[PDB]
Amino acid sequence: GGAQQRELERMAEVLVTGEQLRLRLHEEKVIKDRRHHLKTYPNCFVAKELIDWLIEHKEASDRETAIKLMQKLADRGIIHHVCDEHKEFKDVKLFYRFRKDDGTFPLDNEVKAFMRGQRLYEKLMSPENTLLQPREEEGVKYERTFMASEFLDWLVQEGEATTRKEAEQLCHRLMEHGIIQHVSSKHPFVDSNLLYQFRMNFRRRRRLMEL
Amino acid sequence: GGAQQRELERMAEVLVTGEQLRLRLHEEKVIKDRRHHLKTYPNCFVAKELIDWLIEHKEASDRETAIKLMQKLADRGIIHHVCDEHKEFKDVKLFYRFRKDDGTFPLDNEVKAFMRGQRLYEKLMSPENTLLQPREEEGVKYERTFMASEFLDWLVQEGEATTRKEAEQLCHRLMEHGIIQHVSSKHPFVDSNLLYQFRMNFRRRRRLMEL
């Protein structure tokens, strides 16, 4: 994997693990609409309460390390402090901002392809999936291959792409960013019976303490 | 105009007029990175100062009506009060929220197509543009037509689409949502010499006072 995989892991894993946490906290009602002074702030958690929860569910060893983990999510824009935004515009010396000027947290195309590729790899490495097999091309045995045509077929049936031409562009992006490769000759992706492999050998999703 | 156009105008015109204000306020440095107690708040304006500016530039007769106009923008999420979001996560009773749980302002495909079409229509009404002409098809005279092939050429040349097939898909959306039409309702959009028109007769951009 090397430097590319290390840096793509840095970019992507906290986003993946952070999203997993968000879903868990909704299911457990730690995130909910909260009222404070007759004012409703929707879909909020309380910092102290989340620290409690993290330790309570053995996601963090102590208060100090739970704070460090949530700080990492705050630093990457995954969570933010909810301050009191006045809803009423008034003739006062307060700062205002156009929503279009709000800061964003965009992902470049390499990171997007990495994160798409990891979802596919996890599905294809599951017992239920059988696309990945040792196969032969021009008399060479290769491990963990998939056929270009079969991969395009599966991408649609699973709903990872709407159409074959859409799924084809996805594979070209996966090729461009080194997520997949032709079994031997750096050949491009072609809708054919040629064999391809994952170049990127993704590691399991991180737990919170592993960030 | 009719019912479809009235409701698409309600959805879109405040967004266009508000965006135009954002660009103008940037040009005039009413929006800029502002410092407040050793914390830099980027791309902000000061409410009172914008009221000043609106009156100075005759967008509002008085402060009360200028406030009413900016409230309209705030109500549609175009502007918001910038409050102090603590960057450091602390073991405190403060509300936090996942960014993915922040409120959003989605636009459906019909409004997007309406807004795309209005931008294209304005460009085709610029003095240097010559795409729109009276032309004849199957012996019938039509006004304000454009040819599909010429329109696709221009859409790519103008950068409204990266590629010719992307420009083609845009036109299909314009047909789907009644923004453009075939001169005689006999064909979909086809990359060819067939003639098309704007079905939507867009009205001039709203002034702030008209929203």
Author numbering:
A (entry chain B), B (entry chain A): 20 to 230
Which passages does the manuscript contain on this structure?
DEP domain-containing mTOR interacting protein (DEPTOR), conserved in vertebrates, modulates the activity of the serine/threonine kinase mammalian target of rapamycin (mTOR), a master regulator of cell growth. mTOR acts in two functionally distinct multiprotein complexes, mTOR complex 1 (mTORC1) and mTORC2, and DEPTOR is the only protein reported to bind and inhibit both mTOR complexes. DEPTOR is a 46 kDa protein comprising an N-terminal DEP (Dishevelled, Egl-10, and Pleckstrin) domain tandem, herein referred to as DEPt, and a C-terminal PDZ (postsynaptic density 95, disks large, zonula occludens-1) domain. Biochemical analysis and cryo-EM reconstructions of DEPTOR bound to human mTOR complex 1 (mTORC1) and mTORC2 reveal that both structured regions of DEPTOR, the PDZ domain and the DEP domain tandem (DEPt), are involved in mTOR interaction. The PDZ domain binds tightly with mildly activating effect, but then acts as an anchor for DEPt association that allosterically suppresses mTOR activation.
To obtain a pseudo-atomic model of the second DEPTOR-mTOR binding interface, we determined an X-ray crystal structure of a recombinant DEPt region (aaDEPTOR 1–230) at 1.93 Å resolution in a domain-swapped conformation as revealed by small-angle X-ray scattering (SAXS) in solution. Each of the two domains in DEPt adopts a characteristic DEP domain fold comprising an alpha-helical core and a protruding beta-hairpin arm. In the DEPt, the two DEP domains are interacting via their N-terminal alpha-helices and a C-terminal extension of the second DEP domain that folds back onto the first DEP domain. (b) The DEPt of DEP domain-containing mTOR interacting protein (DEPTOR) crystallized as a domain-swapped dimer. The domain-swapped dimer is stabilized by a non-native disulfide bridge between C102 of the protomers. The DEPt is monomeric in solution in a conformation corresponding to the conformation found in the crystal structure, which is related to the mTOR-bound state by a simple domain rotation with minor translation component. Binding of DEPt to mTOR preserves the overall fold of DEPt, but is linked to a 3.6 Å translation and 39° rotation between the two DEP domains. DEP1 of DEPt, which mainly mediates interaction of DEPt and mTOR, is more conserved than DEP2. The two positively charged patches in DEPt were recently described to bind to phosphatidic acid (PA).
